[PDB]
Design an enzyme around this catalytic site. Sequence first.
Site, PDB file in Angstrom:
ATOM      1  N   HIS A   1       0.839  -1.200   0.000  1.00 29.91           N
ATOM      2  CA  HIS A   1       0.000   0.000   0.000  1.00 29.91           C
ATOM      3  C   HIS A   1       0.875   1.251   0.000  1.00 29.91           C
ATOM      4  O   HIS A   1       0.946   1.990   0.988  1.00 29.91           O
ATOM      5  CB  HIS A   1      -0.972  -0.022   1.184  1.00 29.91           C
ATOM      6  CG  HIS A   1      -2.075  -1.025   1.037  1.00 29.91           C
ATOM      7  ND1 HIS A   1      -2.138  -2.178   1.787  1.00 29.91           N
ATOM      8  CD2 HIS A   1      -3.155  -1.051   0.220  1.00 29.91           C
ATOM      9  CE1 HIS A   1      -3.205  -2.874   1.440  1.00 29.91           C
ATOM     10  NE2 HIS A   1      -3.840  -2.213   0.488  1.00 29.91           N
TER      11      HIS A   1
ATOM     12  N   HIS B   1       1.355   1.505  -5.775  1.00 27.29           N
ATOM     13  CA  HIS B   1      -0.038   1.095  -5.787  1.00 27.29           C
ATOM     14  C   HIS B   1      -0.959   2.233  -6.232  1.00 27.29           C
ATOM     15  O   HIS B   1      -1.870   2.018  -7.023  1.00 27.29           O
ATOM     16  CB  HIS B   1      -0.452   0.582  -4.410  1.00 27.29           C
ATOM     17  CG  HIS B   1      -1.900   0.229  -4.305  1.00 27.29           C
ATOM     18  ND1 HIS B   1      -2.521  -0.640  -5.177  1.00 27.29           N
ATOM     19  CD2 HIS B   1      -2.850   0.621  -3.425  1.00 27.29           C
ATOM     20  CE1 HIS B   1      -3.791  -0.769  -4.836  1.00 27.29           C
ATOM     21  NE2 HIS B   1      -4.016  -0.012  -3.778  1.00 27.29           N
TER      22      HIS B   1
ATOM     23  N   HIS C   1      -6.087   7.469  -2.641  1.00 32.61           N
ATOM     24  CA  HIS C   1      -7.014   6.548  -1.977  1.00 32.61           C
ATOM     25  C   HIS C   1      -6.449   5.698  -0.837  1.00 32.61           C
ATOM     26  O   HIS C   1      -7.221   5.088  -0.089  1.00 32.61           O
ATOM     27  CB  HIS C   1      -7.670   5.633  -3.010  1.00 32.61           C
ATOM     28  CG  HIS C   1      -6.859   4.419  -3.334  1.00 32.61           C
ATOM     29  ND1 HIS C   1      -5.825   4.435  -4.243  1.00 32.61           N
ATOM     30  CD2 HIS C   1      -6.937   3.149  -2.876  1.00 32.61           C
ATOM     31  CE1 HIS C   1      -5.299   3.228  -4.330  1.00 32.61           C
ATOM     32  NE2 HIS C   1      -5.956   2.429  -3.512  1.00 32.61           N
ATOM     33  N   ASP C   2      -5.121   5.632  -0.738  1.00 36.66           N
ATOM     34  CA  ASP C   2      -4.431   4.860   0.307  1.00 36.66           C
ATOM     35  C   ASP C   2      -3.378   5.708   1.037  1.00 36.66           C
ATOM     36  O   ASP C   2      -2.487   5.161   1.677  1.00 36.66           O
ATOM     37  CB  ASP C   2      -3.765   3.596  -0.276  1.00 36.66           C
ATOM     38  CG  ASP C   2      -4.719   2.397  -0.386  1.00 36.66           C
ATOM     39  OD1 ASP C   2      -5.597   2.208   0.489  1.00 36.66           O
ATOM     40  OD2 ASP C   2      -4.581   1.621  -1.356  1.00 36.66           O
TER      41      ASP C   2
ATOM     42  N   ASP D   1      -8.632  -0.615  -7.635  1.00 31.66           N
ATOM     43  CA  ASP D   1      -7.905  -1.016  -6.431  1.00 31.66           C
ATOM     44  C   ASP D   1      -7.395  -2.454  -6.563  1.00 31.66           C
ATOM     45  O   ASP D   1      -6.338  -2.782  -6.026  1.00 31.66           O
ATOM     46  CB  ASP D   1      -8.817  -0.883  -5.195  1.00 31.66           C
ATOM     47  CG  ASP D   1      -8.044  -0.730  -3.870  1.00 31.66           C
ATOM     48  OD1 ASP D   1      -6.862  -0.297  -3.870  1.00 31.66           O
ATOM     49  OD2 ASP D   1      -8.648  -1.025  -2.805  1.00 31.66           O
TER      50      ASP D   1
ATOM     51  N   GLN E   1      -5.856 -17.310  -2.767  1.00 27.72           N
ATOM     52  CA  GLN E   1      -5.911 -16.483  -3.966  1.00 27.72           C
ATOM     53  C   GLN E   1      -7.030 -16.942  -4.895  1.00 27.72           C
ATOM     54  O   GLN E   1      -7.745 -16.116  -5.458  1.00 27.72           O
ATOM     55  CB  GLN E   1      -4.558 -16.462  -4.689  1.00 27.72           C
ATOM     56  CG  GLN E   1      -3.534 -15.520  -4.064  1.00 27.72           C
ATOM     57  CD  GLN E   1      -3.913 -14.050  -4.200  1.00 27.72           C
ATOM     58  OE1 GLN E   1      -3.806 -13.466  -5.275  1.00 27.72           O
ATOM     59  NE2 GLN E   1      -4.338 -13.445  -3.096  1.00 27.72           N
TER      60      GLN E   1
HETATM   61  C1  LIG Z   1      -8.348  -8.320   2.197  1.00 33.77           C
HETATM   62  O1  LIG Z   1      -7.623  -9.544   2.062  1.00 33.77           O
HETATM   63  C2  LIG Z   1      -7.095  -9.804   0.804  1.00 33.77           C
HETATM   64  C3  LIG Z   1      -6.861 -11.148   0.519  1.00 33.77           C
HETATM   65  C4  LIG Z   1      -6.325 -11.461  -0.731  1.00 33.77           C
HETATM   66  C5  LIG Z   1      -6.037 -10.454  -1.655  1.00 33.77           C
HETATM   67  N1  LIG Z   1      -5.505 -10.796  -2.915  1.00 33.77           N
HETATM   68  C6  LIG Z   1      -5.232  -9.862  -3.782  1.00 33.77           C
HETATM   69  C7  LIG Z   1      -4.661 -10.287  -5.107  1.00 33.77           C
HETATM   70  C8  LIG Z   1      -5.476  -8.466  -3.469  1.00 33.77           C
HETATM   71  C9  LIG Z   1      -5.316  -7.259  -4.130  1.00 33.77           C
HETATM   72  C10 LIG Z   1      -4.800  -6.949  -5.483  1.00 33.77           C
HETATM   73  N2  LIG Z   1      -5.725  -6.222  -3.322  1.00 33.77           N
HETATM   74  C11 LIG Z   1      -6.142  -6.756  -2.190  1.00 33.77           C
HETATM   75  C12 LIG Z   1      -6.645  -5.973  -1.068  1.00 33.77           C
HETATM   76  C13 LIG Z   1      -7.956  -5.491  -1.075  1.00 33.77           C
HETATM   77  N3  LIG Z   1      -8.493  -4.757  -0.069  1.00 33.77           N
HETATM   78  C14 LIG Z   1      -7.696  -4.482   0.992  1.00 33.77           C
HETATM   79  C15 LIG Z   1      -6.379  -4.905   1.103  1.00 33.77           C
HETATM   80  C16 LIG Z   1      -5.840  -5.668   0.054  1.00 33.77           C
HETATM   81  C17 LIG Z   1      -4.416  -6.126   0.171  1.00 33.77           C
HETATM   82  N4  LIG Z   1      -6.004  -8.130  -2.230  1.00 33.77           N
HETATM   83  C18 LIG Z   1      -6.303  -9.132  -1.269  1.00 33.77           C
HETATM   84  N5  LIG Z   1      -6.819  -8.798  -0.065  1.00 33.77           N
HETATM   85 MG   LIG Z   2      -7.100   1.205   1.009  1.00 26.34          MG
HETATM   86 ZN   LIG Z   3      -5.798   0.477  -2.450  1.00 30.58          ZN
END
Ligand SMILES: COc1ccc2nc(C)c3c(C)nc(-c4cnccc4C)n3c2n1
Ligand SMILES: [Mg+2]
Ligand SMILES: [Zn+2]
Length: 322
Positions: free
Chosen positions: A78, A82, A116-117, A227, A279
């Site tokens: 993050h 990103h 956004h982050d 995102d 995944q």
């Molecule tokens: C919130 O658990 C997870 C679990 C698996 C994830 N696999 C991916 C590929 C991924 C990507 C791109 N982006 C996020 C994400 C989304 N929302 C918040 C935080 C993250 C890292 N993920 C994942 N998040």
């Molecule tokens: Mg975020």
């Molecule tokens: Zn994000």
Amino acid sequence: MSICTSEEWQGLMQFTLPVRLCKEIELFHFDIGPFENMWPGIFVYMVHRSCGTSCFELEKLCRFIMSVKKNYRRVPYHNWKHAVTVAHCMYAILQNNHTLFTDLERKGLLIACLCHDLDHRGFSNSYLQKFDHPLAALYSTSTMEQHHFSQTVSILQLEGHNIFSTLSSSEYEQVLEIIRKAIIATDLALYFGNRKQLEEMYQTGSLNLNNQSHRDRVIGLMMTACDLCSVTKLWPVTKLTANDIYAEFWAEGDEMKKLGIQPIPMMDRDKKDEVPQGQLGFYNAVAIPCYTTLTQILPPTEPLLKACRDNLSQWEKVIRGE
Ligand SMILES: COc1ccc2nc(C)c3c(C)nc(-c4cnccc4C)n3c2n1
Ligand SMILES: [Mg+2]
Ligand SMILES: [Zn+2]
Ligand SMILES: [Cl-]
């Protein structure tokens, strides 16, 4: 708030984008990876191509971007990288759906995506809501995202950073609210209800883009799609990014370990073997349905779904031994 130096934004002002990148940037699958020094300039470029060269005052825009960068932390996932990746995916969706969205929305979404982050620490809302910690106190729900928007406004409030000041007072509050909502949408907790509502709205036929409530939900799913866009890149990129994602997850386990809590498998580095299965479950229940609904609503976004479909097929290969 941390502020950019004079040489940083002036350097960005003087930056011109290479001609070969212009054609590539238009594509959904474009990976910003190999062009680190060009990331702020890639954003300047996308804003100019989407909104116009005179939309924002260049000096203010360049001060805004470079300061936004300095308020992303040096965390595995993050981070500044990103933000640009998410921003670029938004540009791609916008360009293929240009007239569906007003100039204010396009200005709004691009800046929201980059922001956004902001000031992410590598910790989830769950971690902060369970521990406390003066962020779940300030923001009871949804949580880091409220911090990110708070951070966005704080940057806009720095000397010569307010890119939106030239807008009419009505438009200024319009754009801020567009941004507020868009950033809040990136809370994946809210994604699941949002996509089900849109699924309902599209299937029955009731979906209407002139409807502001419907419109807010569309933009929300767009923020989710962006995102998640690393699930839509070439497998080697997709695969490597996942490593950065779990590096953060595992560290959130490590701190839970350091303070006597037993984390979920996803955040347990002693459970890496479960990652490919997690995944698959993430694609099947989150990514695949997200890009599927988005393609139904915005048909030109289909390449995002297919690149996700291929990346799912890659994760299944990992599982089966191939
Ligand atoms: C919130 O658990 C997870 C679990 C698996 C994830 N696999 C991916 C590929 C991924 C990507 C791109 N982006 C996020 C994400 C989304 N929302 C918040 C935080 C993250 C890292 N993920 C994942 N998040
Ligand atoms: Mg975020
Ligand atoms: Zn994000
Ligand atoms: Cl900060």
